[PDB]
RNA sequence: GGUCCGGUAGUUCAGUUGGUUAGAAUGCCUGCCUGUCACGCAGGAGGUCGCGGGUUCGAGUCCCGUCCGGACCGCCA
RNA sequence: AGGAAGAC
RNA sequence: GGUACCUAACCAGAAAGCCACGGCUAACUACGUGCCAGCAGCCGCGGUAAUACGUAGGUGGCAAGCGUUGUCCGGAAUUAUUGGGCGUAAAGGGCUCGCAGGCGGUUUCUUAAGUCUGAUGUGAAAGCCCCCGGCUCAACCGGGGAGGGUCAUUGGAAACUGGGGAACUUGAGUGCAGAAGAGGAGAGUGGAAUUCCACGUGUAGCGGUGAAAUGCGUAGAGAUGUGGAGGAACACCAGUGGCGAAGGCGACUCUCUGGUCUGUAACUGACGCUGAGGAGCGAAAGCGUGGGGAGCGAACAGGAUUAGAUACCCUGGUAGUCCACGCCGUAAACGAUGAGUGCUAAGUGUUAGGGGGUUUCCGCCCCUUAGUGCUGCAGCUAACGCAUUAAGCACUCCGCCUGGGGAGUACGGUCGCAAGACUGAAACUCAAAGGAAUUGACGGGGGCCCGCACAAGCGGUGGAGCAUGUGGUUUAAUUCGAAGCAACGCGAAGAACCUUACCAGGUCUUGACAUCCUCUGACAAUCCUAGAGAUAGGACGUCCCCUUCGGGGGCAGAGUGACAGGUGGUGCAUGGUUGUCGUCAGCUCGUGUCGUGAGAUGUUGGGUUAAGUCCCGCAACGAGCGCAACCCUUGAUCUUAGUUGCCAGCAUUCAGUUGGGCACUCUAAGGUGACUGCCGGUGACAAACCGGAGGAAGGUGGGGAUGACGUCAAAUCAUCAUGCCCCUUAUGACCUGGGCUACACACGUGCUACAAUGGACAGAACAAAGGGCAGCGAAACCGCGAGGUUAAGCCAAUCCCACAAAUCUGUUCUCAGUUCGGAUCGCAGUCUGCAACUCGACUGCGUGAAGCUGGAAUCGCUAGUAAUCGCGGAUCAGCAUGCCGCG
């Protein structure tokens, strides 16, 4: 009884996939293994706040590129992450891996980082309203064309669970050539479990 | 204490008169309508006649003994 | 100026 | 009384509690309890996360005290002179005449009762206050002043209120000249209708309501033309017009009579206003006595309607309504606005006058009163609203209110023939009852508009058999969840055993599931005893890599505690998803105006659209989510791209397979294209609507995807997750068998039919979209059959599923429980699987059931749509009537 997920509605027609390959008659166990890579990358790089990973097959070699938007607390001495990730990933999948990193300039317009920012202030236990206003101000001072933010759950009141919305600019969810970046994040506090949905209208596609 | 009428579906009354084959409402059950109940509308139901004897076209309609009701009389010094 | 219709 | 004080000699040691901590009201956190125990001065708190209950800690107020109770004053402007009100909140007497009472126009003299101001005597002393002194200020004790007086005598002032004398005319009356009136009481007269009676004509119905019926009528009704009787009320004139103090007063004439208004200036000269008690009127209904009684008509009766209907509706109909004489004395007796007087912008009608400008002509204008309206400033109000006919600004007098019930009640009085009228408590109980406005919802309220909503049709549902779900019921369990639309072929896109959670049986304690401590450093499989499960022991039977000989690379096992697991409860502890209203067209914000405020405006109004879609006025101007477009697919063509298609144009063969070539269908990239693009008529020329043309389609071409703010505490703890509960020598685990599929019943959804718009048999057909390597499986052979055999081809525009049926031509049946229909039942099989009894599908037989198109009601359907006919696909070893998709 809600809107259909906009990234899942945009993929295939305007949005290119995050995976660019084919597997025949071994499709199932490649999906199982590369989701094991994606959960392991998420679990060990949640501190480094990856926006997205994207993979490809190189005829029994796999190429991984990871979008993290900062080298600073991520690359270490420069080779530490690539040795500690490439040997570990070789140990897990048993196949030849290659890894590369990419950065996002104007780094406050990426939705997964925005929802992780909101979630991080929720375990930081600053007030949710201050989190919404500060993130709205951060996204407009970075510059954008529209932001809609939602946080639902038990927001400090024990006996009621209600959502809060905060928006600015235009976010049409029904124009197809619109390039909404959408993100859902999950926050665990002593009050309970809180859901964040942020979706950003960055630009236009002709 | 005598006299006269009745004892029928869960309830109230026809069939007691018309010796053959047991009926009408109400109530009960199922379905329909309405969000639900009530109304309302479609179908469905048991009774052998207070208890025992007899006899015939054939005993529920005939009579007797008992029980339960209703009515009348139970007077004269 | 052209039907009676209850209750939660 | 050796008491306070003065000198001293030693000890921080003997000496602090009460209340509160949600808001008022300064001061908060955890644990128990979980509509129980309890708190509470009011709001109210507690039905598993209690800042409101009890603890524990801490804080806050006060302090030798601190709280509760009781009483009084405040805040209470909440009995209001200071200091309230009465249109709608509680509150204007029903209205008049007036006694006592309360107020009084101007001027001029006069007294000093009221008024103001000195003098004297008094209002004792302690008390309050002002200024000083003493006990170690202090509490207190003193010394000197201020008064708590409408106080008594007396002096002074005369403005105002009073007492007196004399003027004045505006307030108020009288006269004189005019005007209007449904003002009242009595007597009389008139016409139209209704009823009743008599007669003439006249046939068969009249009346009545949403249909109806009771009633009246062949003993002559109703209609119709006459003539009498009697009662009531006076059509049009008739007017938000007139008159009256109020109630009220409408036919006309007469007798008597009450007022009102205009003008004058001839008079009297403050005669005035209000009015407690008192007296008098006073709608309708009611009562007593005597009349009258046409119509209407409580009561009452019959007829309906309804579940009942003592009611609305129909037919009758007594008291009453009418007159005279009395009584009662009430109304939403209303302007829900007491009477009187005076000031304060205007506009416009109407009633009765007066005066002026060329008229004694018609009318035209300007003053002018006294009504009677309607708009509308300042001003008032809480808004509505009032506004020279105040609810404005004042002055006098009167009446009345002080929260809602109980109550206009009980008691007690005065009236009354009576019913009742006037006056009118309390005990007790609640924390609200209200007034006016705003936002929604709703209406058997209105106005436009839309949708298979109803209407027009087609085909079904219950009716029969069967399949699959739900409730009930029994069992060892029939695992749970869902419950009107929006649960019930739903989660399940597949239960023989695992699935499986549920039941029975026999078995486990760091367990298969994640990491630390220590070894062996590689573990297992093959056959037995029980074996069905763990287990216990046996035959080879705990068997890698780096290795400065130290040790590591986490796979396998072994013993240990921290442990892990919960498809267990809580969707009303939650995120995450979903349906619904609903593809309905709406939902809001910024800035600014209007409003005391809630709010309003934009977002309403007009014209069209499917739309809050577009445009024109507008205290609005804009913006955002929605709508429409962009996306996908189906609809024609150009270029490129021709194999694993096309065989056109050619030669070849039954396999048209081939030798050769892309123009066509075909697969598909870029496009071309349809967008209000032209004409006419409407529409103020705008936006839009209708009819026309190359066109494949004209007015979003068809369909999909797309589902706003929110509602239903809607559904899911069954993917994951703090919150509690039991375990961890067990609700957690292993397996065997059972159950989820039972069955007197009722329902939801579907399938198959009841047939000759057919059945059976025989022959010719037309070929969409998907799936295929632990597979799809062609040919051929065997088989009265599902199937079996070796098996060519295919990792797919080639090979297989793929043999499409309904369709078209022949014979039969001839209307039947049949050559329909196929369900149950026995026999014999095929396939899958360790295993088809509980509980799979399919085939050959035989058996042939109910059913002859289905009541109340009820469902879907508008340019391939319903209906039929098949075909694939998904979960899966096997199982379709379920679901998805295609023709």
Cβ–Cβ contacts within 10 Å for residue A98, how many?
A: 14
CB-count burial class (<10 Å; 0-12, 13-18, 19+) for A202: middle
The footprint of strand D (CB < 7 Å) covers A 1-5, 9, 13, 24-25, 146, 150, 152-154, 158-163, 165, 167, 169-177, 184, 186, 188-197
- Nucleic acid strand D: bases within 7 A of protein CB: 49, 573-581, 623-632, 705-714, 721-722, 773-774, 795
Q: Which long-range contacts (C-beta less than 8 Å, at least 24 apart) are formed by A21-27? A: A21/A55, A21/A56, A21/A57, A22/A57, A23/A57
Please tell me the total number of residues recorded for chain A in this structure.
Answer: 206
∠ Cα A95 A99 A103 (to 5°): 160
* Nucleotide nearest A150 (Cα, C1'): D575
Which nucleotide's C1' sits nearest to the alpha carbon of A151?
A: D575
Q: How many CA atoms lie within 13 A of A130 on its CB side?
A: 7
Closest to A202 in 3D by CA, of A178, A184, A183: A178
In Å, what resolution does this model reach?
A: 3.3
Count helices and strands in chain A by DSSP H and E runs: 5, 7
For the four alpha carbons of A18, A39, A122 and A6, in that order, the dihedral sign comes to: positive
From the CA of A131, how many Å to the C1' of D438? Answer: 36
Nearest residue to A198 via CA among A50, A6, A1: A6
Task: Point out which residues pair with A194 in neighbouring strands.
Answer: A187
Q: In whole angstroms, what is the distance from residue A66 CA to residue A55 CA?
A: 9
Which residue(s) pair with A61 in the sheet?
A96
Whose C1' is closest to the CA of A167: which nucleotide?
D624
Distance A180 CA to D557 C1' (A): 55
Distance A69 CA to D108 C1' (A): 112
């Amino acid at each position: 009884g809600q809107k259909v997920n906009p990234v899942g509605l945009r993929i295939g027609v305007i949005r290119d996939w995050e995976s660019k390959w084919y597997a025949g008659k071994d499709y199932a166990d490649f999906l199982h293994e590369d989701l094991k890579i994606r959960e392991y990358i998420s679990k060990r790089l949640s501190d480094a706040s990856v926006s997205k990973v994207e993979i490809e097959r190189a005829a029994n070699r796999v190429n991984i590129t990871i979008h993290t938007a900062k080298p600073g607390m991520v690359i270490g001495k420069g080779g530490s992450e690539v040795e500690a990730l490439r040997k570990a990933l070789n140990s897990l999948t048993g196949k030849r891996v290659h890894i590369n990193i990419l950065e996002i300039k104007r780094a406050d317009l990426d939705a997964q980082l925005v929802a992780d920012n909101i979630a991080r202030q929720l375990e930081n236990r600053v007030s949710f309203r201050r989190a919404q206003k500060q993130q709205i101000q951060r996204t407009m001072r970075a510059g954008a064309q529209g932001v809609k933010t939602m946080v639902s759950g038990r927001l400090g009141g024990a006996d009621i669970a209600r959502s809060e919305y905060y928006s600015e600019g235009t976010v049409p969810l029904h124009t197809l050539r619109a390039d909404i970046d959408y993100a859902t994040s999950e926050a665990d506090t002593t009050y309970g479990k809180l859901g964040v949905k942020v979706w950003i209208y960055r630009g236009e596609v002709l």
